[PDB]
Amino acid sequence: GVYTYENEFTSDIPAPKLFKAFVLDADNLIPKIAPQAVKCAEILEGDGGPGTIKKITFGEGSHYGYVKHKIHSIDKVNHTYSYSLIEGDALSENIEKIDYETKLVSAPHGGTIIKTTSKYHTKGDVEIKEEHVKAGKEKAAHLFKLIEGYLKDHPSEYN
């Protein structure tokens, strides 16, 4: 019924330096990459931990709308972050929650590779087109670059 897909991508910053700013600074960096897209991400409980519930509110497009995200488990020692989407305007009652997986890996060349797996659930007949998902993957791969891009800038309080 549902197939899982894994995507690999190489980014700057070491697995650990990116892992922290990827999950520890995600609550603040997530909205930084697309602030006009959402008003602000809030966590009902967990604060970025296991079984944490997140709520995002969109002020653009329809008059109302909000997506919720849930974390399954995080491994700071294994540099692995797993999370899933609970509700969202793009999900609708036809699309069920989606299991998301994030894995940070470093290479001997000095670069850092990041593996992410995604899984979408459906009520039963509601299905999506692989071509549509492939397009979303491209947009996501572009967001990852922005994550390291900001870290590379290294903003100073003096500025």
UniProtKB/Swiss-Prot annotation:
SUPFAM superfamilies recorded: Bet v1-like
TM stretches of this protein: none
Expression (tissue specificity): Highly expressed in roots. Expressed in open flowers. Expressed at low levels in leaves, flower buds and fruits.
Keyword match Phosphoprotein: no
GO cellular component, one term: nucleus
GO biological process: abscisic acid-activated signaling pathway; defense response; flavonoid biosynthetic process
CDD domains: Bet_v1-like (cd07816)
Keywords noted in UniProt: Allergen, Flavonoid biosynthesis, Pathogenesis-related protein, Plant defense
InterPro entries according to UniProt: Bet_v_I/MLP, Bet_v_I_allergen, Plant_def-hormone_signal, START-like_dom_sf
Coiled coil: none
A GO term, aspect molecular function: flavonoid binding
Family under the similarity heading: Belongs to the BetVI family.
Entry function: Involved in the control of flavonoid biosynthesis in fruits, probably by binding directly to natural flavonoids. Binds the natural flavonoid quercetin-3-O-glucuronide with affinities in the low micromolar range.
Quaternary organization: Monomer. Interacts with AP.
Alphabetized PANTHER family for the sequence: OS08G0374000 PROTEIN-RELATED (PTHR31213), STRESS-INDUCED PROTEIN SAM22 (PTHR31213:SF55)
Additional facts recorded: Fruits silencing FRAA3 exhibit loss of pigmentation in mature fruits due to the lack of anthocyanin biosynthesis.
Protein name (record): Major strawberry allergen Fra a 1-E
Species in which this protein is naturally found: Fragaria ananassa
